[PDB]
């Protein structure tokens, strides 16, 4: 055993924090007086200890105290998701660790689709979500079939996170072929800079999952999502096809979401009562 | 071996199931042929297969998959039981028919959780599902882990509700809440129908079942008079044997489905609702 597991910052599925000054995590408590569990998560390929918690690091620690293994956790040396990219093609991000043997496990809001899936296993979903689009509050917009993105200018920006699978489906698709034209222009490199951009009137709208934009949105007064969920798909735990864990790792995903254990991560980490 | 035994189960709008034109015992266009074997008597195993004519959201979804993946099947309704439960340890329905080599799959409204999935192999889920609460519009409760469900008796009067015995939701309640359980025993319908007359006539609080289901059923109420307030989120799966060498290709070609438009296509021709 000792998985190596990556991961990727994007609140609140890993929240990614400074160990302070002996190597260990800040002492944090829920609402409640339950302990904020913490774990050891180095990343950069200068590579520093830091501390990660949120939705998927207690998933985590719900797999390896459930199918007995222990863990060695890093953040993506890219900070990407995943795409297969022309060199005659090859994968980045999560996706490109997970294939080469950096990880054997990918725990992170990493979609399930049929690109991905020809190279790797996921397990049954952990979450179900889709797209949605986040907008600054004064914004009223249709949703993704509203004019000011099917007919773009400079008077209206949108954008996405460069090598998601979203990134790459607005590449492929013919439709979309004056959207990306736009969105090329403005793509950004995380999630997180996307999102301080419209707060600051420096991007209109962020195509993104719902389950991270909502979460926003109730947190941050100044910002709402629009139009409805649409690419309703869901999130999966990611191996290599010949991992002996896929079945025990399903299985167990299964019965976190029937004895209340999906629903309880949640209640602590997504449904919060700020707006 | 490219012709497969495929067993189905009537539930709309999954699948329907109508009667063969009488002189021509031929299909009409657009359903498929489904065989049922219908006994002469109670006192024989004697009985004989009557041709009926199949269709539905599932039952598109298996023609998409016979194209994409290139076998032909004969379908058949299953006779012992209905979606599947563990009886003295030996499994019906469904289930039953792949556990025990009857069936090379099951394509329906078959819910995937952890006790079948010991049993068979399942694909990634094509419809998103759960257990949800239908009430009549007014009713005030906060969903499943309401204490008007987990503890009736500290109310006066008690909540009167139920669910169709021997699925995954009961399996699921009883697992998970045993007072609740037995309570709800009293309230059992024998199926959907007589549960929406029972809300409908004053004689039932709340029905607790599917939620794939409960939103068809709440989209198209004459009236919108009964709603839904999803807990155990899951979905539908096909069911396959264990190391069903048809589980690659079914699990791709339905991902490919979902990110070509053609699952929304058919959610839009199938499912839509007034409500
Ligand atoms: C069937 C799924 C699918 O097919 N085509 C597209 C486009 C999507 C889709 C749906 C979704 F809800 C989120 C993302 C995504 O790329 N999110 C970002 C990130 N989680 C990632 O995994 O890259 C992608
Ligand atoms: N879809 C369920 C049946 C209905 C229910 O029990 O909710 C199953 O496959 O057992």
């Known amino acids: ?275 | 071996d490219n012709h497969l035994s495929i067993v189905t189960l009537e539930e709309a709008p999954f699948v329907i199931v109508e009667d063969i034109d009488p002189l021509t015992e031929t299909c009409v266009r657009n359903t498929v042929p489904c065989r049922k074997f219908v006994k002469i008597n109670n006192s024989t195993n004697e009985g004989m297969n009557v041709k009926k004519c199949c269709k539905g959201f599932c039952i598109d979804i298996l023609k998409k998959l016979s194209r994409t993946v290139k076998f032909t099947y004969d379908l058949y309704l299953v006779t012992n039981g209905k979606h599947g439960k563990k009886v003295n340890n030996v499994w019906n329905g469904m289930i039953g028919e792949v556990v025990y080599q009857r069936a090379v799959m099951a394509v329906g409204s078959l819910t995937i959780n952890e006790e079948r999935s010991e049993v068979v192999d399942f694909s990634v889920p094509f419809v998103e599902t759960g257990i949800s609460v239908m009430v009549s519009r007014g009713t005030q409760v906060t969903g499943l882990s309401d204490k008007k469900f987990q503890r009736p008796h500290d109310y006066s009067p008690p909540f009167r509700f139920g669910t169709v015995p021997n699925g995954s939701t009961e399996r699921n309640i009883r697992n998970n809440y045993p007072y609740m359980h037995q309570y709800m025993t009293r309230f059992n319908q024998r199926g959907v129908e007589d549960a929406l007359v029972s809300l409908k006539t004053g004689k039932l609080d709340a029905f607790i079942y599917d939620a794939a289901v409960l939103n068809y059923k709440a989209g198209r109420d004459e009236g919108c008079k009964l709603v839904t307030i999803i807990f155990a989120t899951t979905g539908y799966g096909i069911a396959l044997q264990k190391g069903s060498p048809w589980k690659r290709q079914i699990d791709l070609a339905l991902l490919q489905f979902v990110g070509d438009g053609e699952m929304e296509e058919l959610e839009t021709l199938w499912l839509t609702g007034i409500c």
């Not at chain 1, 995943?82 to 496990?105: C, F, H, I, P, Y």
């Not at chain 1, 004064?138 to 949703?143: A, K, L, P, Q, V």
């Not at chain 1, 990306?180 to 999630?191: F, G, L, Q, V």
């Open chain 1, 1 to 275: 055993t000792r998985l190596k597991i990556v991961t990727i910052h994007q609140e609140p599925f890993v929240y990614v924090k400074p160990t302070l000054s002996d190597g260990t995590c800040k002492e944090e408590f829920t609402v409640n007086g339950d302990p904020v569990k913490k774990v050891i998560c180095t990343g950069p390929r200068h590579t520093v200890p830091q501390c990660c918690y949120g939705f998927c690091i207690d998933l985590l620690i719900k797999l390896a105290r459930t199918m007995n293994f222990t863990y060695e956790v890093h953040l993506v040396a890219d900070g990407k998701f995943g795409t297969q990219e022309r060199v005659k093609k090859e994968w980045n991000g999560m996706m490109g660790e997970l294939l080469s043997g950096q990880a054997d496990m990918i725990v992170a809001p990493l979609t399930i689709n049929n690109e991905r899936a020809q190279y790797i296993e996921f397990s049954k979903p952990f979450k179900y979500q889709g797209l949605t689009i986040l907008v600054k509050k004064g914004t009223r917009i249709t949703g993704i079939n509203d004019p000011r993105l099917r007919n773009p200018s400079d008077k209206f920006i949108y954008a996405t996170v460069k090598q998601s699978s979203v990134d790459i489906y607005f590449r492929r698709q013919v439709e979309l072929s004056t959207m990306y034209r736009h969105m090329e222009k403005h793509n950004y490199e995380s999630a997180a800079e996307a999102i301080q951009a419209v707060r600051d009137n420096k991007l209109h709208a962020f195509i993104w999952d719902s389950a991270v934009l909502e979460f926003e949105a109730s947190q941050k007064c100044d910002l709402v999502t629009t139009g409805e969920l649409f690419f309703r798909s869901g999130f999966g735990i990611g191996m290599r096809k010949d991992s002996p864990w896929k079945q025990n790792v399903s299985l167990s995903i299964l019965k976190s979401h029937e004895n209340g254990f999906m629903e309880d991560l949640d209640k602590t980490w997504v449904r919060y009562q700020e707006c």
